[PDB]
Amino acid sequence: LKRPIQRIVRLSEEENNLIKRKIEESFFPNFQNFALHLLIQGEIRHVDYSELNRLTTEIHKIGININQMARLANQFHEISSEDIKDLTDKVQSLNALVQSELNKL
Amino acid sequence: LKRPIQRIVRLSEEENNLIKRKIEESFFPNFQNFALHLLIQGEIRHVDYSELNRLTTEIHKIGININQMARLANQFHEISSEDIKDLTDKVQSLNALVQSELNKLIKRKDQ
């Protein structure tokens, strides 16, 4: 025999009905030929979001500044109106760093 | 019995050896889980959202710190109640951007 190896795929009733539609929408007449082609041609794709790593790292160091401001405000229980608008500026600068490093992509 | 239907695929030894190498290259343990996904979806895509969640988690942390600050600032009459508002708006205006603009990225990656 040309193909003596037999592999089984087990299916639910709905999964089987999906398979039937895919066969009909395919170029192939029957399951054997549909499945053979797709198992051989289907290529696994790996996808990650490492292109954001540069942006994540620049946000992070803004983070550590805002973080130490917060630790200090909490240990001295004081905050000034100058600290508030200074925060606001750091916030609108994060808004800039985000649109910028994301258009770059 | 969750899966009471079986379909059979016949292979040559060389086609079967090719499929084994593919199953090893995927995140699926065995032929069942590999075929089921590939025959119904038509592709296998392993997506790692790790770096994207590291981004949104950092933005979340900054938001916590800012809220701690704004809240405290309510204890001081010299700090305008409507200048704390102007800091809290710009944090939600940044969350908005981060979320939408990152969905535009997840679409340009699911293609």
Numbering used by the authors:
A (entry chain C): 7 to 111
B (entry chain A): 7 to 117
Give the article text.
Crystals belonged to space group P21 and contained 4 molecules in the asymmetric unit. The structure was refined at a resolution of 1.9 Å. PcfF crystallized as a tetramer (dimer of dimers in a head to toe organization). However, the tetrameric interface is weak and deemed unstable by PISA calculations. The biologically relevant oligomer was suggested to be dimeric, in agreement with results from the SEC and GEMMA experiments. PcfF contains a RHH domain at the N terminus and a 2-helix bundle, here termed the stalk domain, at the C terminus. These two domains are connected by a hinge region. In the dimer, the RHH and stalk domains are built up by secondary structure elements from both monomers in the dimer. In agreement with findings from other RHH accessory factors, we determined that PcfF binds pCF10’s oriT sequence via its RHH-domain, and that mutation of the surface-exposed charged residues R13 and R16, as well as I14, in the β-sheet strongly abrogate oriT binding in vitro. We gained evidence that this patch mediates binding of PcfF to PcfG by showing that a single point mutation (I70S) abolishes PcfF-PcfG binding.
